[PDB]
């Protein structure tokens, strides 16, 4: 699909919130454990994401995620416009006993996902370089 398209969703595990961004064309994932499903957290995550990748458009499965003034401010400033979550919960479960904190097991799972086999990590850089 278009190389600027991302999907963002918030999942739940162990009483905490995981925000999951998927680069649609590639399957590459960037995830983070957040204190609460708040618009401040979504806005901050979108500023970080957009500084690292050319984010053009963002989709979500919960449109109310994007209603806060603060999320709209982040999209305004960065020039943003408007399944993989169970493959990620699968990998998290496999490595969970190897980390104390869930946040650590999440980043391990992102690592495993992105480098598994090309890999999602390799596809996203190919797709984006080719576009340039
Ligand atoms: C809380 C913690 N303490 C750790 C490690 C490793 C070590 C020696 N210590 C100190 C320790 C634990 N027990 N003893 C007998 C000593 C780790 C860790 C580092 C790299 C990976 Cl890949 C996975 C875990 C984490 C990890 O947290 C971090 C990533 C630091 C926020 C986690 O959440 O487990």
TrEMBL record:
Q: Which residues form the Integrase catalytic domain?
A: 1-128
Q: Which domain of life does the protein's organism represent?
A: Viruses
Q: Where in the cell is it found?
A: Host cell membrane; Host cytoplasm; Host nucleus; Virion
Q: What is the protein's given name?
A: Gag-Pol polyprotein
Give the shown range, full length included: 56 to 208 of 288
């Amino acid at each position: 699909c278009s190389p600027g398209i991302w999907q963002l969703d918030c999942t739940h595990l162990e009483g905490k919130v995981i925000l999951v961004a998927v680069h649609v064309a590639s399957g590459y994932i960037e995830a983070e454990v957040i204190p609460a499903e708040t618009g401040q957290e979504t806005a901050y995550f979108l500023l970080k994401l957009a500084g690292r990748w050319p984010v053009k458009t963002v989709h979500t499965d919960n449109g109310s995620n994007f209603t806060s003034t603060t999320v709209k401010a982040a999209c305004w400033w960065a020039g943003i416009k408007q399944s993989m979550n169970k493959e990620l919960k699968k990998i998290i479960g496999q490595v969970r006993d190897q980390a104390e904190h869930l946040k650590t097991a999440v980043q391990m799972a992102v690592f495993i996902h992105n480098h598994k086999r090309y890999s999602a990590g390799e596809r996203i850089v190919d797709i984006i370089a080719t576009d340039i």
